[PDB]
């Protein structure tokens with residue numbers, strides 16, 4: 001179960017999200033920003049965060065990243081996050097997983113945030129447990145092993161460019177929490 005709370009332009013939380021979005025997407029008109037409150041999904045995300053925070057030392061395991069999707073996926077994502085049956089997984093080049101962008105402009109592409117019948121576009125500002133990452137490749141269904149001599153000990157995510165990332169691919173449930181939905185237009 002979940003709730004959706006629309007944020008008022010005056011709210012500092014609205015400002016924070018909007019500021020991030022407008023670094024690359026100020027040419028768009030923001031209609032609204034909503035917080036998604038799904039307790040079970042959040043708890044499960046935090047449970048993953050705790051285990052990663054113990055394991056990776058000084059690593060800042062969490063990033064806030066963007067994900068565009070069609071209107072029709074919003075119900076699915078609000079309930080289940082970016083889980084196995086999430087339809088928006090046609091990008092394959094860095095792995096078969098869910099893609100998140102460092103900057104909003106990637107996610108604002110019409111192929112990802114498909115405008116609906118009323119012209120509105122949908123981008124989530126998502127907490128993602130990027131952890132320790134490496135370069136992705138087309139064949140991945142889970143991250144690569146850190147050392148091939150232990151095939152079961154894997155990276156947390158993959159990226160297009162390890163030292164200047166523009167995207168991250170996550171492969172597991174509870175690795176991303178869909179905290180805010182930004183509804184906007186041209």
Ligand SMILES: Cc1nc2sc3c(c2c(=O)[nH]1)CCC3
Pocket residue numbers: 066067068069088089091099100101106107108112113167
């Ligand atoms: C459905 C969806 N697919 C993809 S692939 C990709 C991004 C993206 C997104 O935001 N939504 C952002 C950068 C590379």
